[PDB]
Design a binder for this molecule. Structure first.
Ligand SMILES: *[C@@H]1O[C@H](CO)[C@@H](O)[C@H](O)[C@H]1NC(C)=O
Length: 515
């Protein structure tokens, strides 16, 4: 089949343009996934109070800070209580002689009149719009979990649909669905509706993710395939800096969601100029259309040998690919074959740890440091060198030590975050960034390692099981943030322990580097 592509041009103008387009689309998709750091940022809040907020009331000479002392009780975090207010104004606290014994918990009431939010950084967020605070604090991580479950279901549906209808058609409708559901979510009137539309948007995101990579492989000669996979991975790295810049420019959540959704109407449009995969068309029994597509691409590449191709050449040569359908395998087959039991268990655990840790940490940057725009930028800045150095080490020192060291380093960097003093926000930010870079390198290492652990027919099923395990773990990722009620150290402790244990499992895998 590669010789046909060399009769069409296995790496030329067409592949360059296609790669550029799909890289850009992946950048915007990454912005879609990371958006809720800025769309659902939690501004500081307090109950609405008659004295503080009703400017129409009788004015007084007291300073704003004195009124804040008079109205809102002190909270655990050495700050105003974010969910309670005094039943009656506590004038007695105004004198410096006041003591905590002067007021009882019975003298505080939960916010009846709602909350007042800080607008200095963000003009509006879904948290401020729908009051996802206090009793409703669980609703933000629940929304993120619903988005990731949408990704899981979309990935499940993409395979059968992609085989029945083709890569390009599914990619086109995935683009359209992403644009429509991102625009619908921006104007949602209520929180449940917002969750529904985010779920369907993730449903489309999964199809874009899968079909972009699949369709890039099948039009590229084998001598350039790994480079294309690397560039596809780097598009995600650039998506973080894109998110940082766009969110820095746009401080309003509706406009931000709209801005990151509009680009996919253009992606939908240029998807119509993309040719469908020739392998799929021939295997489906459509040689004429496949020949049309191949002559199309050869014309794009300015390649003369379009004169030579005929349907007889296509059918006779690719017949061996058409014959490939004869040997299916199940997930149950992986677990039944004695020796693959161990490899499957540990590999699945590593995939699960990657997804769990990355999407647990990356979606609450507001806890990891001071400035979230710079954190979002810097995880993208670190991801690139991390992944390419991971490739260098993986070609030098083998799969097993590199994967183990990457996961262990990520775990140790995240665990240290729980031990460092809070005053050193800079050091904490650096450690968090390094941990996420380590997780990205582990993603690279496992992506390559999985294809080598298993025999050829089971290779694809094993990779599918791993990816599905990662998508399932990402769902549990955000929910662990609910444990933060007992202190922010516990979510980070979980996020840190998991990669450590999965790295210590990586040491037990068998090596595959040829020596
Ligand atoms: C603010 O004070 C005025 C005083 O006349 C009152 O009528 C109004 O209801 C107060 N606002 C709220 C939200 O209670």
């Amino acid at each position: 089949f590669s010789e046909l592509l060399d009769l069409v041009g296995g790496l030329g103008r067409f592949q360059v343009l296609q790669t550029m387009a799909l890289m850009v689309s992946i950048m915007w998709l990454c912005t879609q996934s990371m958006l809720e750091n800025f769309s659902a940022a939690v501004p500081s809040h307090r109950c609405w109070a008659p004295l503080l907020d009703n400017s129409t009331a009788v004015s007084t000479s007291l300073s704003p800070e004195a009124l804040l002392a008079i109205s809102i009780p002190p909270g655990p975090n050495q700050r105003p209580h974010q969910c309670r207010r005094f039943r009656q104004p506590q004038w007695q606290l105004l004198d410096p002689n006041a003591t905590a014994t002067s007021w009882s918990e019975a003298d505080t009431e939960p916010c009846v009149d709602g909350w007042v939010y800080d607008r200095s950084i963000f003009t509006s967020t879904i948290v401020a719009k729908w009051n996802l605070v206090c009793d409703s604090h669980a609703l933000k991580p629940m929304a993120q979990s619903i988005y990731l479950a949408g990704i899981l279901v979309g990935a499940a549906a993409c395979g059968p649909a992609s085989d029945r209808f083709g890569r390009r058609l599914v990619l086109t409708w995935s683009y359209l669905q992403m644009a429509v559901m991102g625009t619908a979510a921006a104007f949602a009137p209520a929180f449940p509706v917002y969750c529904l539309f985010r779920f369907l948007l993730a449903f489309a995101v999964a199809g874009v993710m899968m079909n972009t990579g699949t369709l890039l492989m099948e039009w590229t000669a084998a001598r350039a395939r790994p480079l294309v996979m690397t560039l596809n991975s780097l598009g995600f790295s650039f998506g973080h800096g894109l998110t940082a810049a766009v969110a820095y420019g746009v401080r309003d959540w509706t406009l931000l969601q709209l801005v990151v959704s509009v680009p996919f109407f253009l992606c939908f449009l240029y998807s119509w100029w993309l040719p469908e995969s020739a392998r799929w068309l021939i295997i489906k029994g459509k040689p004429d259309q496949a020949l049309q597509e191949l002559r199309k691409v050869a014309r794009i590449n300015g390649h003369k040998e379009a004169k030579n191709l005929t349907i007889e050449v296509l059918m006779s040569s690719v017949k061996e690919e058409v014959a490939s359908a004869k040997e299916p395998r199940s997930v149950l087959d992986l677990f039944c074959v004695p020796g693959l039991r161990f490899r499957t268990c540990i590999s699945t655990l590593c995939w699960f740890a990657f997804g769990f840790t990355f999407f647990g940490l990356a979606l609450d940057l507001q806890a990891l440091g001071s400035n979230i725009f710079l954190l979002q930028m810097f995880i993208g800045v670190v991801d690139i060198p991390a992944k390419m150095g991971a490739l260098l080490l993986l070609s030098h020192l083998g799969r097993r030590p590199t994967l183990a060291a990457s996961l262990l380093l990520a775990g140790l960097c995240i665990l240290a975050n729980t031990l460092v003093p809070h005053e050193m926000g800079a050091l904490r930010s650096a450690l968090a960034v390094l941990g996420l870079g380590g997780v990205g390198a582990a993603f690279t290492c496992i992506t390559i390692y999985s294809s080598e652990l298993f025999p050829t027919v089971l290779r694809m099923t094993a990779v599918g099981l791993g990816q599905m395990a990662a998508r399932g773990g990402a769902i549990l990722g955000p929910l662990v943030r609910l444990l933060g009620v007992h202190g922010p150290w516990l979510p980070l402790l979980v996020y840190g322990t998991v990669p450590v244990l999965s790295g210590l499992a990586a040491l037990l895998l068998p090596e595959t580097q040829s020596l």
